[PDB]
Design a binder for this molecule. Structure first.
Ligand SMILES: CC[C@@H](C)C1=NCCS1
Ligand SMILES: [Cl-]
Length: 152
């Protein structure tokens, strides 16, 4: 991975978790990326989220950990994540582990450089989720939800 090439604007496409409530409509992880800015030791993210039906912004900075390719950020507990796959110019797939109260769950996300991705890429992401124990029923196609596109 050449992490500088993930810089810029992205859209949240598919959102998946082995703890489904976290990504349901009022869940803390139901967030919609707008950009990723690559810094020397970190990644700076801007997201939107819906709070009581209203779009709202979330800004996070994730720092490199001592494990190559891994980043950490505090948000509803302690999160670590990695980049599983990307072609830089169309898609990126993230894998995240949240810890809170000594309990963990996984989050996987598919972002696109455009507001949608084709079925081939989506199905490949679904299979990768299943490879992590994230079942098909726990993958949400955010293009059929409020992603706060109007707020971008
Ligand atoms: C808490 C933010 C979370 C949704 C992230 N996903 C990919 C990088 S940060
Ligand atoms: Cl929308």
């Amino acid at each position: 991975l050449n992490v500088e090439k993930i810089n810029g604007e992205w859209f949240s496409i598919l959102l998946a978790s082995d703890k489904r409530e976290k990504i349901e409509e009022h869940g803390s992880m139901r967030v919609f990326v707008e950009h990723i800015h690559v810094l020397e030791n970190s990644l700076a993210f801007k997201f939107h989220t819906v709070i009581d039906g209203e779009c709202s912004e979330i800004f996070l900075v994730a720092d490199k950990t001592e494990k190559a390719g891994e980043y950490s950020v505090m948000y509803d507990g302690f999160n670590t994540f990695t980049i599983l796959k990307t072609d830089y110019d169309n898609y990126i797939m993230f894998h995240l582990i949240n810890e809170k109260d000594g309990k963990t769950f996984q989050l996987m996300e598919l972002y696109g450089r455009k507001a949608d991705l084709n079925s081939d890429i989506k199905e490949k992401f679904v299979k990768l989720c299943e490879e992590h124990g994230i079942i098909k029923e726990n993958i949400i196609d955010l293009t059929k939800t409020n992603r706060c596109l109007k707020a971008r």
